[PDB]
A = this chain, B = another copy of it.
Amino acid sequence: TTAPKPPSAFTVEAQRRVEAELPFADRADFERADRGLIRRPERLLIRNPDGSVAWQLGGYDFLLDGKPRDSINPSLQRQALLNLKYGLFEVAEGIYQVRGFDLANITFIRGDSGWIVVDTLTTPATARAAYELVSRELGERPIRTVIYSHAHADHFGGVRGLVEPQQVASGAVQIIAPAGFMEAAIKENVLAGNAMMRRATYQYGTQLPKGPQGQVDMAIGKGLARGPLSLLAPTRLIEGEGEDLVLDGVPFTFQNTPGTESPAEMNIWLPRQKALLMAENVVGTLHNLYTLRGAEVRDALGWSKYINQALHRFGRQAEVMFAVHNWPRWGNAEIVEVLEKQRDLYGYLHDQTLHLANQGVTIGQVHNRLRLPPSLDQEWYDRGYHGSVSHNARAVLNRYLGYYDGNPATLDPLSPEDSAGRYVEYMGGAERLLEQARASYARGEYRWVVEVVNRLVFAEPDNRAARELQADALEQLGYQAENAGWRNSYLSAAYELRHGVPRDQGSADALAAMDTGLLFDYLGVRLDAGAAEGKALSINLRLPDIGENYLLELKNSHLNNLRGVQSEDAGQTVSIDRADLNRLLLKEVSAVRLVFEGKLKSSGNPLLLGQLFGMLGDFDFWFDIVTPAA
């Protein structure tokens, strides 16, 4: 069958073990998450301008009664219910948050004459809804300052729902960010963007229903609001180690924590309230050193040290600690302990992964050997809801030693679709492998079943019996998973094995924010090597609006670009505003039109830029993951 199955006896038993192993009697988070509530609006529904729906929570009504569901890990169920504590809250005097309107929180700090707003959610409609809630409960006041705590779309993406460019231009609104915001806001999402976004469908569970056999939570929030991605550039950057400022009479200390959860990030200390806003360094979960959708491995050592610096600078004096995800902590001794343990969590993960690695434990083993000590294991905010000890330990190991385990048996591996037929043959053929795998399934050996049956799937991708057993086993693993990403991934893979992948199926602000060099780097990634083979051309590119020149050199099937160089020998020189180049690439405009408008001038051979663009391919979104290519 093609539908979700009940949790097996083995999965049920695994959930009871979770209950035996974790501190469910510690219910203090339920108090914390309701503390200071001003309004929880009754039927949240946020729509976008084009009529699409950005966010709603009605889907999670099944969680409200608190009754345990064996298709959900009970530790994950606990988090899922706590993340449903949404609405407008007071953190401290003149400090509020709107939580559960998006993946992240949005913070409103009362100024003498207006608000200082920290972060802006993922899309303008959710930010605007949050602001409207604030206005209704607390009174309407202008926003004079918007601060980006760090460079991720769930923090800067809704900025246009709060402010417009003319308010920035007139100086009515400042935008404050850590130095390195603009580079960090775009870079890592670009060159490998289609791969990352497709893989993220699994981690976010975008094709799953909301429900007990579907998506239930996203660890740091319910999920990501859907809508246009906005971004307005900072007018003031916090440099070096940080800075002390006064904003509309309120004193702010910014502590830059470069290269932890984001390349550009800062904590915020508010001495008048003794309130510490920990960016996304410290949330209600272990975070990602490595995000499954795919990016570079983060530095656990620097992350751990930056938390210790916060602890040393502010920990002694903090009365409340709050975050850009999840809920606050009140009281100095609690806050000190949370900081200490989070510092030591990332620290232990790092140091002990390398301790094992130095003993010869490989990237293929470390997750099955590394275990937190009780002092770190037994806090709810250290649980692997977003990150996991398992995939993080692997990541630290991969950061230091790479993907290769050291064993030359694995140095030149056959692609799995090329080794699959032989695995299957050696195992007695498809029916015999299925027979053996079903017996393994009936002993609950799901981690093994998904390994071996995946071989049959890759040998015989249209074998329905193998797809359905693989899916069943993956599902049970998803039911079992404490980690929301893991859960979403397993259930998504079962979904695609049962149903197949979608047959039926870019932000202008993001493009504007991309450095020109990176834009040409991406066009080089698009280059179709067959079309480029044996060609050679070069183009001088002049961009007067931004005062930058590039030299583009196509040769040996590689597109090169260099900032601030021109060649007397280039075959063509193209003058074009970056803003117009952007419009061209977003297909808001044609090349011919820009000529006619006096916006795209050319000397030399006028065909070369057209010829280069004609060499660029595109990528299909819905690539195969759990089977080989159709």
Chain A residues engaging chain B, CB cutoff 8 angstroms: 191-196, 198-199, 202, 290, 292, 294-297, 301, 304-305, 308-309, 312, 340-341, 343-345, 347-348, 351-352, 354-355, 357-360, 363-365, 367-369, 373-376, 390-391, 394-395, 398-404, 406-419, 422-423, 425-428, 433, 436, 440, 445, 447-448, 450-454, 457, 470, 474, 477, 486, 489-490, 492-493, 521, 524-527, 529, 533-534, 553, 555-560, 562, 565, 617, 619-620, 623-626, 629
Contacts and interface: CB of A to CB of B under 8 A. Distances in A.
B358 A556 contact: no
10 contacts: A191-B400, A294-B406, A348-B557, A355-B526, A360-B625, A376-B556, A391-B411, A408-B477, A409-B457, A412-B447
A557 B415 contact: no
A626 B526 CA distance: 40
Contact of A493 (B191, B354, B409): B409
A534 B553 CA distance: 61
Contact of A400 (B192, B348, B355, B474): B192
B451 A368 contact: no
A533 B373 contact: yes
Nearest to A524: B351
A332 to B, nearest CB: 15
A557 B347 CA distance: 9
Given A309-B562, A390-B412, A490-B411, A294 B402 contact: yes
Query: Main SS of the interface on chain A?
Result: helix
A447 B413 contact: yes
| For the complex of A and B, 4 pairs with smallest distance between CB atoms | A360-B623, A294-B401, A409-B454, A344-B556
Contact of A426 (B452, B454, B470): B452
Contact of A560 (B343, B399, B489): B343
A194 B358 contact: yes
Given A192-B358, A305-B562, 4 more contacts: A198-B406, A343-B560, A391-B411, A413-B447
A551 B200 CA distance: 41
Of A202, A357, A565, which is in contact with the most chain B CB atoms at under 10 Å from its CB? A357
Of A373, A414, A558, which is in contact with the most chain B CB atoms at under 10 Å from its CB? A558
A365 B402 contact: no
Contact of A556 (B340, B401, B403, B457): B340
A344 B406 contact: no
Contacts of A409: 450-451, 453-454, 457, 470, 474, 493, 626
Contacts of A290: 402-404
Contacts of A368: 414-415, 418
Contact of A375 (B395, B423, B557): B557
Contacts of A556: 340-341, 344-345, 348, 373, 375-376
Nearest to A453: B409
A362 B568 CA distance: 42
A202 B344 contact: no
Contact of A195 (B401, B617, B619): B401
A555 B556 CA distance: 56
Of A354, A408, A414, A433, which is in contact with the most chain B CB atoms at under 10 Å from its CB? A408
Of A401, A445, A625, which is in contact with the most chain B CB atoms at under 10 Å from its CB? A401
Given A358-B192, A415-B364, A422-B448, A373 B557 contact: yes
B419 A191 contact: no
B347 A558 contact: yes
Contacts of A454: 407, 409-410
Nearest to A355: B525
A166 B477 CA distance: 66
A408 B427 CA distance: 22
A395 B399 CA distance: 11
Given A355-B527, A364-B416, A404 B347 contact: no
Contacts of A344: 555-558, 560
A559 B398 contact: no
B358 A400 contact: no
A375 B376 CA distance: 56
A415 B409 CA distance: 15
Nearest to A617: B355
A195 B355 contact: no
Given A358-B525, A407-B493, A422-B448, A400 B486 contact: no
Nearest to A494: B408
Contacts of A415: 364-365, 368-369
Contacts of A558: 304, 343-344, 347-348, 351
A413 B304 CA distance: 27
Contacts of A450: 408-409
